[PDB]
C-alpha cells in the first residue's frame, strides 16, 4: 500500500534457449505521491516537505491574530494507485 | 535590456504576478514560504539593473512559529501584539 | 485460593537496588510492583482471578452455526439441513478459540430449533407438534440425499429426536481429535508436495451434521431454523497468541485486509479535558 | 559478566560478547520423545551431532527502510547438510532448534529488531479472494520480507508489517518466545525452541512448525561516513532430532 | 556496580546509571526532633509522604561561558505542592532534604561542576555601601547565577564567582557537603543534608537554612555538531518534615 506497480503483473518460467528463464523481468513499485499540499490564507504549513507519501501528514498553523478553523493536519491517502489528501485544509479567520 | 526570472531564493517565492519579462528598475519582492517569516531588516527584494542583471539577494527567511494562539482568558502584550517573526526560542507574554 | 498478590508496605529508599531498571532485550517481562518504585501501605488484597480461568472463559454456550429447512417440497427449498461441523463461521466464538494455538476439551452441544409458517392469503391449518431429527455423521458415514433417505435410520450414528415445546435438546461429546489436541492453526498443507489445502481445513474433520422434520408433510409451507451451540468443558489450552485484529473474511483460511493497529486521535499528547467547572 | 556467552552443538560453536540472556521456549528445553507419548512403533534414528549443529542461513541487509523478514522451519533447512537428508528419507521428524540471530553495528548506530518464533504462523494472502502458494510462504534459506505497505500479488502473502501477515497486531507478537536486538545494548539474540505441536511428530516438508520473524521497531539510522552496511545473519541448530518412517528420498 | 542507584521518597523515584556514591551531610542522616531537644510544646504535624517527596525545579542551561548558579532553601520550595502549603500555615518548620543534581552529556563533551550545600550562606552586596534585597538573594525555584566579573547592582549580590558572593575562596567550598559532576565519569550528584541550625526549628520564609551552589571549575566544551544544549536540573526532597505553630496562611 502506497506504491504503484510499474511493469508486468506476472512472469512465467519458460524454456529459454539452453535453460528455463522467467518470461518477464521484475516490475517496479514506485512511491505514490500526494499532490502538493494546499497553501492557505493567513496560515502556513509547519515543516513543509518536498514530497508526501502514504500516511505522511501536513500540519497547518494560522499566522498571528488569526484563528484556525478545522483540523490542524491532513494526511496523504493512496486509494487507488493515485495519491489524495484526506480532506480539506483548515481555514484561518482573522 | 529586460531581466528574466528573478534568482532562486531558498524558502522564498518572488511575486511575479504573473509576468515573464521585467523592464529595468523593476523591483521584485520575495515572499517567505509557509513556516517561514522574513528576518527583520534583511533584503527581501531585488531589482532589474543595467545589463539585464538582477540585484543581489540572499536567504532572509528564518523558521518561525505561527502568530501566537488566540486565547479567551488572555491577550498578547506589546510588542508581541504586532509581531510576526517568532524564531525558535521566542517567548511571548500575555 | 486463586487470590491476588497483596501489596507489602514500603518506605523510603536510597540504595544500589535497581528494580525499576531492566532490559526488555532479554525477552523478560519486568516483575516490578508499586512497592518497588514508591512508598506503599500494606493491603490485604482479597480479589480473585477465578473468572479469568481458561475454563470459566471458554465454558459458555456460543452459537456456531444456523440454517433453515422447510417442510413442504415446493420450489427449490431445502427440506433438510447439512453442515460440515467447525467453529469458523461465527466470529465471536472463533476469535476466542484463536487466542490459543492448541485446545483439548470435552463439549456440551445444545440445539435451539424454532419453526414458523410462511406468509399467505389462505393458510388456516392445525398441524400437530413438529418433531425434528438431528443426526451426526462422522467422516465416511453415508450421507442422506433426501428427507426420506435410508441414512436417517440412525443404525449406529448418534441422533436426537426432539419435539417443539420441550427444552432445547442437548448432549455431551468427548475429545474427538485424532491428535493429542485440537488445532486452531495449521501452517502446513494436506499434501506432501506442499499444495492442496492450507491451514485448518487441511487436517480438521469433525464430520457432518444433518437435520430434518420427521413429520411427513405440512398443508402449507413452513420452515424451521436450527442454531447449534458449543460449550467446551474440561478445557486445556496451549501456546497463546495475538488476538484477531483484522475482520474475518473466509471461514476456510486466515485471509484479511490491512487493518489499523487501533483508533486514531489528535496527537500523542492529546488528552480530553473532562474538568470544566 | 553475563554479557558474554558461548554455544556448542556438534562441531559448531558460537561466540558472543554482547548478548542478553537466553530465552528458553515456553520454559521448556528440547527433549527426545518419551515412550509414554510415542506413536510410531519403529525405532527412531538419532543422528545427534550429525544433524544437531549450527546451520547459518543467507545473511540479510538491514536498511533504513527495511520492514522485516521471516523464515519457516524446518522447511528452510531442507538443503542443510544431513539434517536435510533425514527430512527427505523420513516420513516423520521431531527437533528442538536453537535460534541465534546476529547483528552488530556500533555505539553510533541505532535501531531495534524483534526476533520472534511464531508456532503455526498460518499466514494470509494478498488477495483475500484467492489462496497462497508454498513458494510464497517459504523459499529455502532465502528469506521473505515484510513490506511497509500493502501487497497485491495473486498468491502472495500480505507482507504489510503492521499485521505481520496474520491479521494481528505486531506489538502483540511479544507473546511468543522472543528477544530484541537493541543495537545500543545488544549484538544478537538467542532462543531455544522446544518441539511445539499437537502431535508427537510430523512431516517436515508438509508442515511448517514455526516461523522466525525479525521485525524492526526502531528504524536503522546513523550519520555520514558511518558504515551503511548492517547485515543480519540467522543461525539455527536442531536439538534432539528424531526420525521415523524411513523410505525412498522425497523428490523436491 | 555502585554506579547505578535508585532513590525513593513518597510517590517519587529517581534513577541513575552513572552516580558517584552519596554524600550524607556531616555524617548525619535526617531525623525527627527528639523530646529532649524540643521546645515547641504543641504536637507537631508530619505530612510524611505528602511533603517528603522529590520536587524538581526549573532546569538551567550550562554554557561555555556559564559562571554558576545558586538556590536558597527552604524558600525555593515555597510553591511546591503541600511542602509549600505547610510553610504558609506554620510558624515553625524542620526538614532534611535530599539534593539530587542531574546533568548528562556524552563521552565527547567535557566539564566539571561543583554541587555544594552551604549552611547559613550569608551573602554580600554588589555595592559594599548598601544592603541586599531578599528578591536578589532568592527568587522561588528561579535560580540566581554567578557572573565571571564584578557586579554593580544597587541591592544586588556580588555575583563574582571567585568569591562565591561570600568574600571567600571558591576552591575552599569543598569544606561543605558536596560532590562534583565530572561529565567524563559522572551524570549527577546526590547530597543528603541533615537539619543544620543553632535552633531545634525555625521559620522557613524568614530564614534560608542553606544555599545550593553549582559552580563549574571545568568549562563546558565540545566539538562541532555536538549537542550544544546541556541542561542542569535540580531535584530536592524534604526529609522528616515537622511543623509547629498552625495559624492563618502567610500572604507572600
Ligand atoms: C455429535 C456432534 C459432534 C460435533 C463435533 C464437534 C467438534 C468440535 C471440534 C472443534 C475443533 C476446533 O475448534 O479447533
From TrEMBL, chain C:
<dbReference type="GO" id="GO:0043657">
    <property type="term" value="C:host cell"/>
</dbReference>
<dbReference type="Pfam" id="PF22663">
    <property type="entry name" value="Rhv_5"/>
</dbReference>
<keyword id="KW-0449">Lipoprotein</keyword>
<keyword id="KW-0946">Virion</keyword>
<protein>
    <recommendedName>
        <fullName>Genome polyprotein</fullName>
    </recommendedName>
</protein>
<dbReference type="GO" id="GO:0019062">
    <property type="term" value="P:virion attachment to host cell"/>
</dbReference>
<keyword id="KW-1035">Host cytoplasm</keyword>
<keyword id="KW-0519">Myristate</keyword>
<feature type="domain" description="Picornavirus capsid VP1">
    <location>
        <begin position="24"/>
        <end position="242"/>
    </location>
</feature>
<keyword id="KW-0945">Host-virus interaction</keyword>
<dbReference type="InterPro" id="IPR029053">
    <property type="entry name" value="Viral_coat"/>
</dbReference>
<keyword id="KW-1143">T=pseudo3 icosahedral capsid protein</keyword>
<keyword id="KW-1160">Virus entry into host cell</keyword>
<dbReference type="InterPro" id="IPR033703">
    <property type="entry name" value="Rhv-like"/>
</dbReference>
<dbReference type="GO" id="GO:0044423">
    <property type="term" value="C:virion component"/>
</dbReference>
<keyword id="KW-0167">Capsid protein</keyword>
<dbReference type="GO" id="GO:0046718">
    <property type="term" value="P:symbiont entry into host cell"/>
</dbReference>
<keyword id="KW-1161">Viral attachment to host cell</keyword>
<dbReference type="InterPro" id="IPR059138">
    <property type="entry name" value="Pico_VP1"/>
</dbReference>
UniProtKB/TrEMBL annotation, chains D, E:
<comment type="similarity">
    <text>Belongs to the picornaviruses polyprotein family.</text>
</comment>
<comment type="function">
    <text>Localizes the viral replication complex to the surface of membranous vesicles. It inhibits host cell endoplasmic reticulum-to-Golgi apparatus transport and causes the disassembly of the Golgi complex, possibly through GBF1 interaction. This would result in depletion of MHC, trail receptors and IFN receptors at the host cell surface. Plays an essential role in viral RNA replication by recruiting ACBD3 and PI4KB at the viral replication sites, thereby allowing the formation of the rearranged membranous structures where viral replication takes place.</text>
</comment>
<comment type="subunit">
    <text>Interacts with protein 3AB and with RNA-directed RNA polymerase.</text>
</comment>
<comment type="subunit">
    <text>homodimer.</text>
</comment>
<comment type="function">
    <text>Protein 2B: Plays an essential role in the virus replication cycle by acting as a viroporin. Creates a pore in the host reticulum endoplasmic and as a consequence releases Ca2+ in the cytoplasm of infected cell. In turn, high levels of cytoplasmic calcium may trigger membrane trafficking and transport of viral ER-associated proteins to viroplasms, sites of viral genome replication.</text>
</comment>
<protein>
    <recommendedName>
        <fullName>Genome polyprotein</fullName>
    </recommendedName>
</protein>
